[PDB]
């Protein structure tokens, strides 16, 4: 899976497990809401929001292809 490969590549850029998990959750599919809508709701701080957002946007771009 190139999707899984790309997401693992991105998560590898983030140090803490909590932040890596934020990326994996971001990459999870959601067809009712945008990355921005989902990210507005995150309570775990800027480091998590950054990872969540990057992984969410990349996963969406890939799947559109």
């Amino acid at each position, epitope marked *: 899976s190139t999707l899984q490969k790309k997401i693992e590549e991105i998560a590898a850029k983030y*140090k*803490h*497990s*909590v*932040v890596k*998990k*934020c990326c994996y*959750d*971001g990459a*999870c599919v*959601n067809n009712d809401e945008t990355c921005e809508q*989902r990210a507005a*709701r*995150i*309570s*775990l*701080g*800027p*480091r*998590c929001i950054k990872a*969540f957002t990057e992984c969410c946007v990349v996963a969406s771009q890939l799947r559109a292809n």
Partner: antibody
């Protein structure tokens, strides 16, 4: 993937010395602060000591300040705790753990990887 | 140390909340408070929280929040495997790292 493993634990007489080590794999060792945390049998967790990724900063609990020395060899993925002047109060299972950056507070996310623990008995 | 209740308990499917109270210098200065789970004879493990919500609004099994000098871990949809000791922690500018005294969670019949 990520693993930590302590060694060096054992029985020692009060006043004696002991050196613990902790070996790490699965991550870039020098990118992470590391801590030692201990737990006396049936008791809670007590933080002992920490060292920054580079080794340039070290931190110690009041109860071990002056007696314990933390260090790391970044070329060998190894962390050490030199314990001197041991007393009965120091008896515990000692864990090494991979820590978050204290500089990230107020968003400090805790210790995300823990070893198996090594038992130190001072008696 | 941080203050936690000695023990909590509930039955399968129930929701339990463990509190953790510190000072203005630790929990009070924190925007996020970390929690650990320790099973008998095992090393502590960092509790990693889900960021995604379930579609029905069902609470996530593990969640946490904080307000002022107090933090809370909530374990819902309680399961036998949740039986363990739980510890909160906080950074502190002079003591570096503090732990709560731990809470024993029992899952009843």
């Amino acid at each position: 993937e990520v693993q930590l493993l302590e060694s060096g634990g054992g029985l020692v007489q009060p006043g004696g010395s002991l050196r613990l080590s902790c070996a790490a794999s699965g991550f870039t060792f020098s990118s992470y602060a590391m801590s030692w945390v201990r737990q006396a049998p049936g008791k809670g967790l007590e933080w002992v000591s920490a060292i920054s990724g580079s080794g340039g900063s070290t931190y110690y609990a009041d109860s071990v300040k002056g007696r314990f020395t933390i260090s790391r060899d970044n070329s060998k993925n190894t962390l050490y705790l030199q314990m001197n002047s041991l007393r009965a109060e120091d008896t515990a299972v000692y864990y090494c753990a991979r820590d978050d950056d204290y500089e990230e507070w107020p968003w400090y996310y805790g210790m995300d990887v823990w070893g198996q623990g090594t038992m130190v008995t001072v008696s | 140390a941080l203050t936690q209740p000695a023990s909590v308990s509930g039955s399968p499917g129930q929701s339990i909340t463990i509190s953790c109270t510190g000072t203005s210098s630790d929990i009070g200065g924190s925007k996020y408070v970390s929690w650990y789970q320790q099973h008998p004879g095992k090393a502590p493990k960092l509790i990693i929280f889900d960021v995604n919500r379930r579609p029905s609004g069902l609470s996530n099994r593990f969640s946490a929040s904080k307000s002022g000098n107090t933090a809370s871990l909530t374990i819902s949809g309680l399961q036998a495997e949740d039986e363990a000791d739980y510890y909160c922690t906080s950074y502190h500018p002079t003591k570096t790292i503090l732990f709560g005294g731990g809470t024993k969670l029992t899952v009843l019949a």
